[PDB]
């Protein structure tokens, strides 16, 4: 029931090794079975 | 309701608030405050961090 997010930002699939450090452990406690990215459509 | 100022003690309106404690399968998120003590260094102490 904890939705854990890890994140990392690299300047410049690139070769190399970089580990991801935990970001936010949310106590959502919900079922997650589908996922979909949401984008921003700038009218300008 | 008969909220008259001249009513008796048993008839005067009173504010009542009911608290419900619900335990669910989801992780608990409303816990009581935790008391903490001072910090003792360079001594054999029983600790809890
Ligand atoms: C949507 O597009 C507009 C137009 O390109 C963006 O406005 C520009 O914002 C940049 C900074 O990111 C400024 O340097 C430009 O001068 C802006 N242009 C104008 C015409 O004002 C706007 O930021 C975009 N919207 C979002 C939410 O990023």
From Swiss-Prot, chain A:
<comment type="function">
    <text>Attaches the virion to the cell membrane by interacting with host receptor, initiating the infection. The major receptor is host ACE2. When S2/S2' has been cleaved, binding to the receptor triggers direct fusion at the cell membrane. When S2/S2' has not been cleaved, binding to the receptor results in internalization of the virus by endocytosis using host TFRC and GRM2 and leading to fusion of the virion membrane with the host endosomal membrane. Alternatively, may use NRP1/NRP2 and integrin as entry receptors.</text>
</comment>
<protein>
    <recommendedName>
        <fullName>Spike protein S1</fullName>
    </recommendedName>
</protein>
<comment type="subunit">
    <text>Binds to host ACE2. RBD also interacts with the N-linked glycan on 'Asn-90' of ACE2. Cleavage of S generates a polybasic C-terminal sequence on S1 that binds to host Neuropilin-1 (NRP1) and Neuropilin-2 (NRP2) receptors. Interacts with host integrin alpha-5/beta-1 (ITGA5:ITGB1) and with ACE2 in complex with integrin alpha-5/beta-1 (ITGA5:ITGB1). May interact via cytoplasmic c-terminus with M protein. May interact (via N-terminus) with host bilirubin and biliverdin, thereby preventing antibody binding to the SARS-CoV-2 spike NTD via an allosteric mechanism.</text>
</comment>
<feature type="glycosylation site" description="N-linked (GlcNAc...) (high mannose) asparagine; by host">
    <location>
        <position position="31"/>
    </location>
</feature>
